Amino acid sequence: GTILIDLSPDDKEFQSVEEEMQSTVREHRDGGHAGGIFNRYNILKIQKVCNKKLWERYTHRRKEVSEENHNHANERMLFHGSPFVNAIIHKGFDERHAYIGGMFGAGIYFAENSSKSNQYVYGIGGGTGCPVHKDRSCYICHRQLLFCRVTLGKSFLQFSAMAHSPPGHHSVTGRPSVNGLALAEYVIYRGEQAYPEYLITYQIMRPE
Length: 208
Ligand SMILES: O=C(O)COc1ccc(-c2nc3ccccc3c(=O)[nH]2)cc1
Ligand SMILES: [Zn+2]
Prior knowledge:
This protein is α+β, with helices and mostly antiparallel strands. It has a single domain (1-208), classed as Phosphoenolpyruvate Carboxykinase, domain 3 (Alpha-Beta Complex). It has four helices and nine strands; from the N terminus they run βαβαβαβαβββββ. The protein has helices spanning 12-23, 52-67, 85-91, 114-118, and strands at residues 3-6, 41-50, 75-80, 108-111, 143-151, 155-160, 171-176, 185-188, 194-204. Strands 1-2-9-5-3 form a five-stranded antiparallel sheet, with helices on both faces. Strands 4-8-7-6 form a four-stranded mixed sheet. The longest helix has 16 residues, at 52-67. Belongs to the ARTD/PARP family. It is found in: Cytoplasm; Golgi apparatus membrane; Nucleus; Chromosome, Telomere. Zn(2+) binds at residues 130, 133, 138, 141. This is Poly [ADP-ribose] polymerase tankyrase-2.
């Protein structure tokens, strides 16, 4: 059911997604071990992910959440990096895309910082890096991230340095409690609460 539509670099939509990607890069406490060393990206392509069935799955669940939370879906646009990106865009998010060992239990994790999601493109901890060169900081190989529409509903706040969401909540928020520059991370426990809106193809760029 999925089609991918290329956005032109001239399109205001391309430009606003690129800006969110670039402006949410930060330094990581691993010095770049997982995701590589970079301050910005080379954006090669941005595609809209269009799947009627998956869209309707997401909006159905969004209405349920909304109606459980005084007509407030608490919808965000967040990044997701995954070795399963090509399955997610065709079949949607589900229990197979969960981070079983994540800090907030088995769920599907999203980030405000694009560079945090970049650490997962080649797997947990960056895995063994790119398939071609076995390099977590590869500057040649093309990487992909998703920029996703995510329904948080009532989110349980965890202050901090598939399972079920906590009773009375639709999600968990991991609030950064030590690194003052880190943005929040989020976890949902139902795949229907995210839609993989944009597929972004990019390279990390070697600092000069
Ligand atoms: O590789 C596996 O075994 C299961 O596959 C995955 C797939 C994705 C992520 C993942 N974790 C995150 C944690 C915090 C913030 C953002 C993210 C993110 O973007 N992706 C972890 C494991
Ligand atoms: Zn490579």
